[PDB]
Amino acid sequence: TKLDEQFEKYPKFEINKVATELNRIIAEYRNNRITVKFRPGDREASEELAN
Amino acid sequence: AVGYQLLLRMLSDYSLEPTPQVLSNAQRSYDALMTDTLVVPSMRRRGDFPVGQGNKYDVFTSDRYYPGDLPLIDGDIPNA
Numbered sequence: 001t002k003l004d005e006q007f008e009k010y011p012k013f014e015i016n017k018v019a020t021e022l023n024r025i026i027a028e029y030r031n032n033r034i035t036v037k038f039r040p041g042d043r044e045a046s047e048e049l050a051n
Numbered sequence: 052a053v054g055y056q057l058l059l060r061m062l063s064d065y066s067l068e069p070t071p072q073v074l075s076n077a078q079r080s081y082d083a084l085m086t087d088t089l090v091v092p093s094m095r096r097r098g099d100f101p102v103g104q105g106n107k108y109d110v111f112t113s114d115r116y117y118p119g120d121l122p123l124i125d126g127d128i129p130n131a
Contacts, residue, residue, distance in 0.1 A: 001098070007122045010099045 052080040 001007075040046040055077035062069055098119030108114050 001120055007120070009122075012099070 052084040055080050 038050045040050040055073075058073070059069060059077055096117040098117060100117050102108065102114060102116060
């Protein structure tokens with residue numbers, strides 16, 4: 001506001017409290033990573049193919 | 052209203068004294084005058100007050116908050 005012919009601004013404080021759960025989820029993922037796995041079939045030589 | 056106010060402000064010239072009935076009439080007329088010219092400013096919002104997420108704002112329209120005054124920036128006069 002003008003506030004006697006100036007433009008002093010409103011104070012705007014931040015207390016971030018919503019990132020804790022997101023960091024928890026990210027840590028949960030990075031603790032147990034996953035990767036594509038190929039499973040064999042009912043054949044005589046499918047195990048070598050999967051390997 | 053105007054006549055009674057003028058009478059009140061001018062009666063002292065002839066050295067008399069107003070009577071309570073005339074005073075009451077003047078007050079009533081002045082009240083009737085003042086009733087017709089009210090203001091009721093109806094104060095606005097603040098300016099940093101967030102607007103709800105239910106109003107469905109957009110990026111290029113801004114209005115994440117109620118509109119307010121905005122600073123003036125000049126690069127020639129070092130006010131800072």
